[PDB]
């Protein structure tokens, strides 16, 4: 478990840089956070053959600057992102039944094309694939001395199109059992001194995987598919349930609805303008996180997952004294309030207004 403290807002970072990080980037990440994940294509420009080695070197540099930092390696439940050497030419260098394929034609069902390189998807119903998956990421975690795995896309195998065209319409529950088997085999390799965090809670997955893992991410915290006050309350409920089991919950927050790396109008503004916007809009998502925050929960804030997408910004809210919560949040209508040793928090979910009173 990462060192957790209520002294200030617990910050989680989740980003990737195509090039090996600069000394300044490493230093900035290390002072902001004790809990970091490097993304799927980190270092792909610096070492296109073995970018996992660049992620490893940058993880070690971060921990040289912050010995308390835990750094997770990215790995995807379903998608063989062809960035690391492990997934290069995946469908071509393994048996036909290791790849997800159209049941009528036998041609691979792809997540995407990266340039001219196909992005294949694993046949999660093949036990040899599940073993290889756990052996591969577990081996990499141990070899490079990462502190755990960020297990992405735990439920994306159940997308209707893959069930109709690939798995068979009757496989959804078997796919859940496949994911569970994958986490169990991975935990057996990376151990209980390391972390398995899966993505994640979605108001199409929930807490059902927590018995086999160490925590989960809320990727759409007030964003995309989950943008209502009812979705917020549901996430707080899942997070409180997770906290009872001593599990980690990572909140990926966003400046406002539609403010993300896919919004072209926003992403075209100057870096100075984007940061100023994000600085001014952190109060509402941060307040929402504080309403439901429990021990071992973390806050991640930005408009994207690139290293320049707002996560390495020094937000003043991260250095003000917070202190332990005095009680769980209380509710009056759609107004939630909570007291911390050094702050009072209030959010109006119906009107999307919030106030953090720093004492």
Binding residues for Ca(2+): 8-9, 318
Residue-wise DSSP of 209-236: GGGGSSEEEETTTTBTTB-SHHHHHHHH
Within 13 Å, how many C-alpha atoms sit on residue 31's CB side?
10
Within 13 Å, how many C-alpha atoms sit on residue 83's CB side?
24
Cα three-residue angle 181-187-193, rounded to 5 degrees: 165
- Length of the chain as a residue count: 359
Burial 260-272 (b: 16+ CB within 10 A, else e): beeeeebeeeeee
Cα three-residue angle 315-237-355, rounded to 5 degrees: 35
Q: Are residues 164 and 172 in contact, defined by beta-carbon separation less than 8 angstroms?
A: no
Pick out the residues of the known binding site. 8-9, 318
Q: Which two tokens stand for residue 7?
A: 């002294």
Angle between the N-to-C axes of helices 172-190 and 127-144, in degrees from 0 to 180, rounded to the nearest 10: 30
Beta strand pairing call for 79-80 and 117-121: antiparallel
- Choose among 143, 139, 152: nearest CA to 57: 143
């Amino acid at each position: 478990m990462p060192a957790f403290s209520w002294d200030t807002v617990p910050v989680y970072l989740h980003f990737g840089s195509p090039t090996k990080m600069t000394n300044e980037q490493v230093q900035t990440a290390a002072r902001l956070s004790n809990f970091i994940c490097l993304e799927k294509a980190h270092g792909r420009t610096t070492d296109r053959e073995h970018p996992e080695r660049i992620a490893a070197e940058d993880a070690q540099r971060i921990k040289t600057a912050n010995p308390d930092a835990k750094v997770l390696m990215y790995w995807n439940t379903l998608i063989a992102w062809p960035f690391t050497s492990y997934n290069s030419d995946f469908a071509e260098t393994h048996p036909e039944n290791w790849t997800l394929r159209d049941r009528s034609t036998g041609e691979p069902l792809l997540k995407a094309m990266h340039g001219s390189t196909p992005v294949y998807q694993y046949n999660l119903l093949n036990p040899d694939v599940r073993k290889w998956w756990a052996d591969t990421i577990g081996g990499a975690v141990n070899e490079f001395n990462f502190d755990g795995v960020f297990m992405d896309a735990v439920s994306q195998s159940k997308r209707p199109l893959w069930l109709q065209k690939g798995w068979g319409l009757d496989k959804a529950d078997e796919l859940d059992a496949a994911a569970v088997d994958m986490m169990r085999q991975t935990k057996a390799i990376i151990g209980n001194n390391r972390l398995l965090i899966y993505n994640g809670f979605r108001s199409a997955a929930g807490t059902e995987f927590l018995p086999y893992s160490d925590g989960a991410q809320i990727e759409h915290f007030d964003q995309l598919s989950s943008i209502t006050k009812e979705d917020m309350v549901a996430y707080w409920k899942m997070a409180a349930t997770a906290a009872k089991d001593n599990k980690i919950v990572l909140y990926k927050a966003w400046p406002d609805h539609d403010i993300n790396w896919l919004n072209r109008k926003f992403m075209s503004q100057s870096p100075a303008k984007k940061e100023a916007f994000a600085r001014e809009k952190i109060t509402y998502p941060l307040a929402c996180y504080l309403i439901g925050a429990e021990e071992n929960s973390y806050f991640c804030y930005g408009w994207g997952y690139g290293i320049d997408d707002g996560q390495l910004v020094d937000y003043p809210e991260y250095r003000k004294p917070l202190g332990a919560p005095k009680s769980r949040a209380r509710r009056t209508g759609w107004i939630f309030r909570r007291e911390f040793e050094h702050a009072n928090v209030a959010v109006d979910l119906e009107n999307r207004k919030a106030r953090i009173q720093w004492l």
